[PDB]
Curated annotation (Swiss-Prot), chains A, B, C, D:
The chain holds residues 37 to 158 of 183 of the full protein. Keywords: Biotin, Secreted, Signal. Disulfide bonds: none annotated. The keyword Transmembrane does not apply. Homotetramer. This is Streptavidin. Its main location: secreted. Biotin binds at Y31, Y42, W80, W96, W108.
Length: 122, 122, 122, 122
């Protein structure tokens, strides 16, 4: 985990994120998107639970990206929840939630759900 | 947002979290749980998208908590995605994803989904 | 369960659904919405798992509604997953997934997630 | 849709389901699982929204399976929400919710979320 999490990751839709896993469970870095009302790099922050593992289990982690930078303000934020699996073909499997700021009347339709798999190879 | 987000929040199950919304979209603080394989305070980190809003919309935000501290290591992490609505009865409505580290065979059943509403009053 | 599930249910946003729980796990009925690109009644079909329960547990169930009737065709369908809890203040607590038909390029943003609580009283 | 939906489908974990799409939006069939506290075939029921589509969009659909048959009673039900895409390599992409019957104290952890992709080839 940590050492193996640090680095560049790519998902199936062409997005990339670079992260540094800090000794005490922190994750900091940037996310560069491929889809959405995104454009350029956005700051990402999150945490991971190291014990993590005498039965080859994954390391649980999560992070958040608010879609605002100096070129765009999409009034939304996405959170990814999943686990890191290391080795030859290390990967981070996640499920995500994207919430948009809405009026109270449209709040029932404010959150989208999806999944993404990230690899060290693109 | 920001100023109105900073402070203590409580949800329906008795959990509490104290957060500080930083000028440039950061959210940092601690979460003290009521349920789970949690015990005491855990560090939380996240982001919010300020524009946020000439049509009284909510401010989108999200944060992560890895369930590890000096008393417990639950090998899991939870991410909350939602929006802040201010005013008299300000609230943060969220949907969350809790992922546990599993072996590859049980990864299909590694993530729980739920929702939580936080208020300034408990 | 079954007998206690049969009847009319109302949720917080003003929607209503009438269902009949059949002896062998079937659920059939109609859903009349309050929000969405819905208008009138739609057919609903689903299943419930009866054992259900010497430790007052809920009865797991789920159903689907395709948003097409003789007045509207929203090209979408919603599925509700949850459990029935009987008694004085019986309720059905659910989480739902609403998927819209999209082109392959927008499929990442095709599903919304939410929750609804239904009661016998409106 | 309909005609193209009728038939046998397989997902990545080895499960199979046979479905018949009825002229008026109904879906009926059986699901034979590969994972879970499942064993054999279970009845499935659902709906699809036909318009469906002059811009090659998918057909939205959903179905439910209660995990009870003459050999097992797992006290749970799963709902799948997604869309059908036809052609050479037709597929049904879905997100699912699996709810277990729990006591009120564990209801916060009663629902698992995941995704599955089904193809006509296994």
């Amino acid at each position: 985990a940590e050492a193996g999490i640090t680095g560049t990751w790519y998902n199936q839709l062409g997005s990339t994120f670079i992260v540094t896993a800090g000794a005490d469970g922190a994750l900091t870095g940037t996310y560069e998107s491929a889809v959405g009302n995104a454009e350029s790099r956005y700051v990402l922050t999150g945490r991971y639970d190291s014990a993590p593992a005498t039965d080859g289990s994954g390391t649980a982690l999560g992070w958040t990206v608010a879609w605002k930078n100096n070129y765009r303000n999409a009034h939304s934020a996405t959170t990814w929840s999943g686990q890191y699996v290391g080795g030859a073909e290390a990967r981070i499997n996640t499920q995500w939630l994207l919430t948009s700021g809405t009026t109270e009347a449209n709040a029932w339709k404010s959150t989208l759900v999806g999944h993404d798999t990230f690899t060290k190879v693109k």
